[PDB]
Symmetry: D2
Subunit: 506 residues, 4 copies
């Protein structure tokens, strides 16, 4: 995707796109005035020998002292090098790309006083698919990971190109660049910000959305497999409750399931008995999850466009002002919010899987297999989904409620947003595994309703799975089937069945 | 407050009012048609010998069997008695009142098939200030607490009147009533619902809001006490970030602090040095908290008006439909959401208190007391705020991520909303204690800036405290001062200083 | 119980006794030498004009300055008053008594330099059953609650006598005392310590033990009610695993159940089928719980006898040394340890209750009631146990992993032991409720095995319950039955059936 | 290391050795009798046409039916294939080796009825350094991972040899084996067990121990760097408290620090002022951690030797008995216990790092760097340690308190031990990072005490670091220094300085 960026206008769908695939971008011409005017403001402050904290000062001792030009420029390098104190596994290229593009976006709104040539250097890196090494951990919400990113601009650190590490000099050259020397305020402009926190949480959101869409299809397949009712999805019920997420959710189920199917019709009377809550309360539970992820997405969509460095430059007035927009508290709470939705999607699916194993509730053979006296069928796959569901409870513990003082008590409250966002990725693997197993069981259960078909989109879901995994006729090595189902989910195999305009970025 | 209820239209401000004080209510005439039509629908189903689950059926064995009229009426009593299996401390009258009014509200929308005379019985109880005993625990989200409430209607259980327990017969008589006998569907109409879950979480919300408002005033007093800057509250900063909660938050700080004060002016140059994050990141942290509580409030305001029983009666079509609107998942997540806001309000305030104890950051005497070599001053009050802040982290653990199967796996996924909401009350006591101590310290610190005044609303806050608690001249028994400050907060002493239309119910 | 205390030798059984009931105590004559020698050491340091931190110094500024005698004595009062900065509900008299006795015990080991007359003042309070007001919260692990306690000695604060609050003067007089004036080091001797942390956690332990014993009897009754097997309790199994808690646990089950009973014999062949894990894995799960609580008890039994103030006086050498024994980290971890045991006792019992509701596993009528089509029986009691079990998961979150800096970063790591211990009390109410419901269901289930008896101790357990709660013949108001069962448990009704020398304090 | 195994006698030191490095083992001749006798018992049951659950039966339907020999042997294969339903990353070879050796150990005690030739097949795999693929997740505590392991024996699955995946046939051949065909009871003997749970938690223990030893050296270096006192380590203090972990801990500090050093002596009077709790309460906090890890180690050392399959064969009596020793509840609690110790080691170290950054407490330059006005020094390294410390709080949430029912409610309470143990590995990376940064800062601080040396073992620790990382003279790229310090710790660089017989496996 080619992108002419109007800074501060990225949509959640564009962000998903940046996250999913390489991008080519350039700044809209309308961005230049504010970018160049905040640089001219910094330039005028220096020209006039005025002192301004975080523009031409030192820190602490010198926080009110106009440093000489010479140490001022050395100070920028010294900040990046000293702040690149992150540790842990390298981020994958997708996430690095996302962080570069959010930083470009934020800087390009023109409140940061950073030269357009430096923004364009980062854009050249993105366009060249050259991605700085950024370690996963260290930020308390994003000095360290942003410093690592910034190292390459200076000819330090290292960067990935076509899946291999290159020296920074080598990587710059790939992008048509040479090492840059930073000017006043540019160290802080690059290092202060919330882009890593935001990127981590956006990834969590996109995964949550992916999982939501898959769960509507899987949940529909399970309803059908156990001869459940469509009545709990009646629009009147959801309208009477009033919750928008549940209303939109029920509408999605109706779209996928339709009014009836050959399976539903062939069991003429399927009401005479009530469906368990893991089926019948899908609109209420999945709806709550949808609301939760929409709340998170509203906050993260705003933050992807935020001016998050410090101090900020207000060239129209001539003012430079020290604030706290680098504090990623709203991102950390958004991430903790997504944790509850990813957890509960998985919880509800696991109880559906357990329903399908139980001969007294499924109207299917025990554990979905013929001749169970000597075949175990799906028994231990349900165990695995139980393990994955359970792990999500502890993982749900919020990180936004913790803080430790830093910078000898000057930076005395912090957000822990990076940790909040990154735990979502594993929570999503857990839930993805649970749904993979649910997908496999419901298709197996429907297969046992010999020759009968479910609805048009749900047959698409059965066919997607059966292209890779066969019916379970008798015990065989189980895990490869789960691996295959998970990979299908990871690739978005079921996402397209969900109606449009339901999920924030879809 | 006198209330002519249009069912389903209660506002968050009305709900706060119902929560805070006795109410007198009657149904708007426009409510009668739908109430009476869903009763007539039930009546027609019975007249016609049709069978309808949850109207004239039994359960399980008999879930598709048209029970005889005789056992049908006995079944209603048997449900209430058997479901009143709650345990723990009695709810206070305020919360009982709130639950009665939400149930009246939900039932009065006319989708429940319950006689108007029974709704009016509950309304007579509320008007008489007669409040059924309801134990705190048992619901997994609200059969037990709603059953306890319903016991009184039948002449069972007990009820509070003017702070004393009365027999149900006695209590009914106080309200002008005699014991009722329930009809078809009315057992389920009263017992299925989410009103206890919702009431518990609304109380959490109102407390969170109370604490938010107090924290803006206390935080402003602390900024002033330590000669902090007003620059971090500049509207331009918050506009550039884009987060609405932070923007509204900063606007509140500006309103209370004003552009300058005698204290700020008398320290001519207060910038030359940067404020710690517990001061300077107040808009970002408190703003995140405001967003979080607005997200919760949107969900709870909808749920206070929801049709949450089962099965629902759609008299316009003649249909009765079993769904799952009793599943309080969105309330449990709303409550878990409020936990993060109450926690983080307290966390940020505690770090402000710790700042004020530190001579190297406060520009005040160590621990805010003269002659510290032999006086301890506020030292151990800060310890107490640290204890209270810390307890909130564990208390933040979400309950919406847990579930246990009930009703022999038919009711196999539940919300745990009651536990989610009720933990908020203690979280709010914790944070209320932290702010009480912050209030005391900042006023003490300002006192040490001899003769100097802060802004008009913040002087109101100083005067409110000093009406009850004196300046700390030398060590004295400390705890009564904290008790007094907490009680002032509990009574809403600082709430009115916050500008209008900021908080959902205010 | 009359107690001649040899300081530092209290047993867990004595501590349970002190906790459960009033005590009369005096110091063994062998305590006087060390008590009086550490006072003489302090006296000699002062006589010789030596300076010693925490003996005749001030703090901070004056932490190395020999304060004049005059301010030295005033400093002791100033510490107690300023440190009595606790808040929250008053502790009950049992816990206050326990804290007084632990403080007496610790001080009476003679490493604290506090006058014997002051120890004897506290002992006179205990003997008089006069209990200082102590608020629940504030300590980060126990300056505030110990200061509150100490207030009465000085004629400040207030105290409970025969359930009513008395002025301190009034309370002192009841005990034969007049207000004391503290000397050098005695402020720190009374205020530094871990006795409140330790008392809170000991209460948790005693409750955990009470619950363990009750769970063996209830679990045995449930095994019998559902025609479970005694084979899983075979000693050979547990010996082969090697875990001592499980071995001791299985031995307890064998003692209560015996080799066979009329119920087991009358179902000749009860193996032909496997018991669910909530029955069959009782030795492994309850055994783990027993190990966990023995680990906690070893640490708490040591701490009940520890010298936990500061600085300590080593009269034999003439040295006074500042250390950190007031840091209650081992207590906080012990309390967090007990949380897992109380949680898992309740978890396992809840799954047994759910088994008994399920006709497909219980060999009993659904929900343990005749004519279930219109009777609900124990259905909603199981819901209540599920609510209580679930709440324990969040409550299990550890507090020992949190800390906030205090005393302007000098006291920069703390334990949070008080919060860790006090949450155990509510966890125990939760689990106590779960077992109460299990007790009721298994007795109901056994009743349905018409005329058949279980083992001798388990019939004792059935009779204990049936003295208060009748068989459930048809739906009736359920909650009073649960209330009655809980109260029986709270009073120790089942504790005596457990064999001796299994539980740390029993 | 060469090992002649006496089954059931593995020590914690042997287990560390197996975990750390390849092993060569053979069974002691004394193992053969019991192994062969339990096989003969199974053989006699079959010879005699007796029926015995889990020996010659089917399951559920057939759980009391003597399956024909033909399907009996096919049933063993069908169990392994169907139970190999794990997912996630492959375990590393060290952990796979550990699990194989625990299974060999458990089986070789002779209560399992499995042929010696099959035990010897596993031993041949270990000796050949051929390690079956085992996925990380799926067990609820260890059917899936044990099934994956067992696949190779049958010629299925895959295995690692010299770091590359081989087909099972290929891997068997490397070890001198051909595919085996399982007999009666051998499917359950291999698949039921707690060895994966136990291996995961043992790894956590070994890491906790490694971290403990490193923290004593780092903590000693920090004491010295900031001119702290040795008095808080006085044996008399710790003896008076009575806690063994703290006593052993203080003894370790005394051994490393000695009575004095050139640094301590050159600051003649270092008392005149009190040390912060992160220094002075090291014995109390680290001691609590030591007790916690010894409690865990006692349980895990027993479980490494336990008979944990089912049903068990008691050949001396001729009895076969179904129990629940596969239930890993004690392992899950042991793992949750280790979480608190790993967390709190890191918490205390982080507060020491923060002390060293603070010029008002360190007696060093701010953030440990010369010319701080334009150099940032260790500022952001402390931020990274704060991030890592914080993440451990959420990670501390216990998994032993959760369970989901499996096997359609027959396996209705489970332990979640695998998740409990595996989270410890990341907690240990977090704490390892914190200590790495503390190591770097204290050595930097000591360097600034120009020319002065600390004690003999602590100079060894300084030299170990300085062999790889230079003094911080001016800002430079920081992260490689932290990487290098972490790798030194990971390799056990500081472990050997700790005195012998302190840590369970050392």
């Amino acid at each position: 995707t080619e992108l002419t960026l109007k800074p501060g206008t990225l949509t959640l769908a564009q962000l998903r796109a940046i996250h999913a695939a390489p991008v080519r971008l350039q700044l809209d011409a309308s961005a230049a005035p504010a970018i160049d005017a905040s640089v001219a403001c910094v330039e005028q402050i220096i020209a006039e020998d005025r002192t301004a904290y975080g523009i031409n000062t030192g820190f602490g001792l010198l926080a009110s002292t106009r440093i000489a030009s010479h140490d001022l420029e050395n100070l920028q390098r010294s900040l990046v090098l000293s702040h690149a104190a992150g540790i842990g596994a390298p981020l994958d290229d997708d996430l690095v790309r996302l962080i570069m593009v959010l930083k470009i976006n934020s800087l390009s709104r023109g409140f940061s006083g950073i030269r357009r040539k430096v923004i364009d250097a980062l854009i050249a890196l993105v366009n060249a698919e050259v991605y700085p090494h950024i370690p996963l951990k260290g930020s308390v919400g994003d000095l360290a990971p942003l410093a690592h990113m910034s190292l390459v601009l200076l000819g330090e650190g290292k960067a990935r190109y076509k899946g291999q590490w290159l020296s920074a000099t080598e990587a710059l050259a790939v992008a048509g660049l040479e090492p840059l020397t930073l000017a006043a305020k540019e160290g802080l402009a690059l290092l202060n910000g919330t882009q890593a926190s935001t990127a981590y949480a956006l990834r969590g959101l996109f995964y949550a959305e992916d999982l939501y869409a898959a769960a509507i299809a899987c949940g529909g397949l399970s309803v059908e497999a156990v001869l459940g009712s469509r009545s709990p999805f009646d629009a009147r019920i959801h309208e009477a409750r009033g919750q928008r997420g549940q209303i939109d959710t029920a509408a999605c189920f109706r779209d996928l399931l339709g009014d009836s199917s050959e399976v539903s019709l062939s069991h003429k009377n399927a009401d005479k008995v009530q469906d368990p809550f893991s089926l019948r309360c899908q609109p209420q539970v999945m709806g709550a999850c949808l609301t939760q992820l929409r709340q998170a997405a509203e906050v993260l969509g705003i933050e992807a466009n935020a001016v998050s460095d410090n101090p900020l430059v207000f060239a129209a007035e001539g003012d430079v002002i020290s604030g706290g927009n680098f504090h990623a508290e709203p991102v950390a709470m958004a991430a903790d919010n997504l944790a509850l939705a990813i957890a509960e999607i998985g919880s509800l699916s696991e109880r559906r899987i357990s329903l399908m194993m139980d001969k007294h509730m499924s109207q299917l053979p025990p554990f979905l297999v013929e001749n169970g006296g000597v075949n175990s069928g799906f028994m231990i796959a349900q165990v695995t989904a139980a393990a994955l569901a359970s792990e999500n409870k502890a993982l749900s513990h919020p990180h936004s409620v913790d803080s430790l003082p830093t910078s000898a008590n000057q930076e005395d409250h912090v957000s822990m947003a990076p940790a909040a966002g990154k735990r979502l990725w594993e929570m999503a693997e857990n839930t993805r595994g649970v749904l993979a197993i649910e997908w496999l069981g419901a298709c197996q259960g429907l297969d046992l309703r010999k020759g009968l078909k479910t609805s048009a989109k749900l047959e698409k879901a059965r066919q997607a799975l059966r292209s890779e995994v066969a019916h379970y006729d008798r015990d065989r090595f189980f895990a490869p089937d789960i691996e295959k189902a998970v990979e299908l989910l990871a690739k978005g195999s079921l996402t397209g069945l969900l109606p449009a305009g339901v999920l924030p970025s879809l």
